[PDB]
């Protein structure tokens, strides 16, 4: 996530009304709720992805220093 | 037309899958650190599975 383009989306997000308004707006296809769900899923997937990046870097370091230990012996 | 149910099944599926993803969210020294590297690999695989599952949930919402 980029903070500059995510502060703006947080601002435009928190200003949304309750779910009743977003339901009564377009009863045919609840576009507003679905867009909210998309935003939430993007946020959470990004968070777990950065967690993956960190843990994979740790695993790469573990492989590297295991190889170094093998080379030392 | 009313989108009364389809949202409901979407909510049920995405909530169950979010719960499942959250479930997986959580010379002798040479051998010990080899075991540590194996544990790190296992954690990496589990967390990658979790993130792939959540990406699938996002794609379901988009679909």
UniProtKB/Swiss-Prot annotation, chain B:
Disruption phenotype: Absence of radial spokes.
Residues with PTM Asymmetric dimethylarginine: 46
Cellular location(s): Cytoplasm, Cytoskeleton, Flagellum axoneme
PTM characteristics: Probably methylated by PRMT1.
Family listed: Belongs to the dpy-30 family.
Miscellaneous note of the record: In-gel analysis assays show kinase-like activity in vitro. However, such activity has not been confirmed using recombinant protein.
Function: Flagellar radial spokes contribute to the regulation of dynein arm activity and thus the pattern of flagellar bending. They consist of a thin stalk, which is attached to the a subfiber of the outer doublet microtubule, and a bulbous head, which is attached to the stalk and appears to interact with the projections from the central pair of microtubules. Binds calmodulin in a calcium-dependent manner.
Protein name as catalogued: Flagellar radial spoke protein 2
Parent-protein residues present: 337 to 470 of 738
